Design a binder for this molecule. Structure first.
Ligand SMILES: COc1cc(C(=O)NS(=O)(=O)c2ccccc2C)ccc1Cc1cn(C)c2ccc(NC(=O)OC3CCCC3)cc12
Ligand SMILES: CCCCCCCC/C=C\CCCCCCCC(=O)OC[C@H](O)CO
Ligand SMILES: CCCCCCCC/C=C\CCCCCCCC(=O)OC[C@H](O)CO
Ligand SMILES: CCCCCCCC/C=C\CCCCCCCC(=O)O
Ligand SMILES: CCCCCCCC/C=C\CCCCCCCC(=O)O
Ligand SMILES: CCCCCCCC/C=C\CCCCCCCC(=O)O
Ligand SMILES: CCCCCCCC/C=C\CCCCCCCC(=O)O
Ligand SMILES: CCCCCCCC/C=C\CCCCCCCC(=O)O
Ligand SMILES: CCCCCCCC/C=C\CCCCCCCC(=O)O
Ligand SMILES: CCCCCCCC/C=C\CCCCCCCC(=O)O
Ligand code: NA
Length: 369
């Protein structure tokens, strides 16, 4: 037994931070470029996207300093201020990203679940105020990391990013860990679980209703081919009334009494009259009063669900489980080297995974933008 982790720590950190810095800087730099140079009006999603991009760039610009530290066999050479600023920067990026993803999911939920006054309840103006609130809250609550005591080794060398290794146990660090775990990870994660449950159930209801509208449109076209005659008519009439009751995907957000909805409902009314009269005359109505009405908002919601869920399971969750395990391990009487090694290797991996959160945000823009 010895400090066998020291070479592993410096090898894995140098590789992963170097990779996260390059992928993170170019990915979010590109996303920021594309969003800044926008001509069409900014969405609530775009407000959250710009803020995620900035929170990611703020942190990727500090990661090259972490790289220089581990390349130097754990010797800090930039002073106290830059050590406290590099530590603070990671926690600010991590908790800002958790809050922006939560706020984005919450907004998209109210948009999907409640399309009546959705465009007035979940506005770009509202997104801007929430983000400011998120920045102030995170910047203030994370400040103790800026006013922490400097770390020095046996040989009086300046250290940075040191974990409570062994017997460095404190009860109020454990109380701060729990408030942070609940407010900063468990409450945001529960809101996402609930919101995503509501979106998925809503998406099934709308997907099944659009299959019936696709089924009535299929029967109208099929019985038209059955003519080229009393049986085909009795079948098209029951379906044309059924299709009239259904709402098309194109006019899903608009009101039921809207003049856009009235036109589609009247189109089936003119077609029902032509059906009772009876083939090339009713084929004209289905190509002028109903062809236009018979969804992307559904694809952007699925894209968001997949990237954000992965970001929570892969990046945010292992760090928060490991921090709970680690802090309690310090309070335990017995500490063998075979357990202290596997604990320290996990700190290296779960922190690298937490820092890799900036790599998920360009993917959120491709799949949900
Ligand atoms: C980020 O808070 C920690 C981080 C660590 C930590 O990560 N330590 S580690 O060695 O690097 C590591 C890495 C990977 C796995 C395991 C470990 C131990 C340990 C304890 C803590 C808890 C903690 C100790 N004080 C003195 C604090 C002061 C203020 C805050 N406010 C905070 O959080 O507010 C955010 C949530 C709401 C908004 C922002 C927390 C703390
Ligand atoms: C939106 C703006 C709000 C941002 C204001 C900053 C937080 C202020 C007070 C909370 C102090 C609670 C910290 C004490 C923990 C108790 C355990
Ligand atoms: C909510 C998550 C529950 C938090 C997990 C409870 C921590 C208990 C633990 O893992 O540590 C026990 C150890 O014996 C004590 O030093
Ligand atoms: C070290 C960490 C402290 C630095 C403070 C960082 C806050 C500064 C800028 C964030 C705002 C950038 C986003 C602009 C978009 C405006 C918006 O939609 O809210
Ligand atoms: C940008 C990403 C990585 C750059 C890291 C710098 C490592 C080179 C050694 C420089 C030094 O320590 O003097
Ligand atoms: C700021 C108030 C917000 C309240 C939400 C936070 C929820 C925290 C609730 C329970 C966590 C239990 C805290 C007990 C401390 C255990 C650490 C110890 O002393 O060993
Ligand atoms: C609606 C989204 C669908 C995805 C499912 C998300 C829910 C997953 C939540 C928690 C998974 C927790 C698993 C943690 C295992 C590690 C525990 C351990 O062995 O110590
Ligand atoms: C699964 C986790 C939590 C279930 C939460 C129940 C609230 C869902 C409301 C149902 C709905 O209208 O879609
Ligand atoms: C929470 C449940 C998670 C996933 C449910 C997936 C079921 C897929 C059936 C889709 C059927 C359809 O699209 O018509
Ligand atoms: C990654 C999961 C997202 C897949 C669903 C969206 C596919 C369409 C697209 O945005 O390219
Ligand atoms: Na992020």
């Amino acid at each position: 037994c010895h400090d066998t982790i020291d070479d592993f720590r410096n090898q894995v950190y140098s590789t992963l931070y170097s990779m996260i810095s390059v992928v993170g800087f170019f990915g979010n730099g590109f996303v920021l470029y594309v969003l800044i140079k926008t001509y069409h009006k900014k969405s609530a999603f775009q407000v959250y996207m710009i803020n995620l991009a900035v929170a990611d760039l703020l942190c990727v610009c500090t990661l090259p300093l972490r790289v220089v530290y581990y390349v130097h066999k754990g010797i800090w050479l930039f002073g106290d201020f830059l050590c406290r600023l590099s530590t603070y920067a990671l926690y600010v990026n991590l908790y800002c990203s958790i809050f922006f993803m939560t706020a984005m999911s919450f907004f998209r939920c109210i948009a999907i679940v409640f399309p009546v006054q959705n465009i007035n309840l979940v506005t770009q103006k509202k997104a801007r105020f929430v983000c400011v609130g998120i920045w102030i809250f995170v910047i203030l609550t994370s400040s103790p990391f800026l006013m922490a005591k400097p770390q020095k080794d046996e040989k009086n060398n300046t250290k940075c990013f040191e974990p409570p290794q062994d017997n460095q146990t404190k009860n109020h660090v454990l109380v701060l860990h729990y408030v942070s775990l609940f407010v900063g990870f468990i409450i945001p994660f529960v809101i996402i679980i609930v919101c995503y449950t509501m979106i998925i159930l809503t998406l099934l209801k709308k997907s099944m209703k659009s299959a019936d509208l696709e089924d009535n449109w299929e029967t109208l076209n099929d019985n038209l081919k059955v003519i080229e005659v009393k049986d085909a008519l009795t079948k098209m009439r029951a379906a044309a009334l059924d299709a009239q009751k259904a709402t098309p995907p194109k006019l899903e957000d608009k009101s039921p009494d809207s003049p856009e909805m009235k036109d589609f409902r009247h189109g089936f009314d003119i077609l029902v009259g032509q059906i009772d009269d009876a083939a090339e005359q009713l084929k004209t109505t289905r190509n002028a009063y109903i062809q236009k009405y018979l969804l992307s908002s559904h694809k952007k919601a699925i894209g968001m669900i997949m990237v954000v869920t992965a970001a929570f399971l892969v990046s945010f969750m292992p760090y928060h489980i490991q921090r709970t395990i680690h802090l309690h391990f310090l309070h335990n009487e017995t500490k063998p080297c075979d357990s202290v090694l596997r604990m320290q290797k996990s700190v290296v991996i779960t922190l690298s995974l937490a820092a890799s959160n900036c790599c998920f945000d360009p993917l959120l823009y491709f799949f949900s933008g």
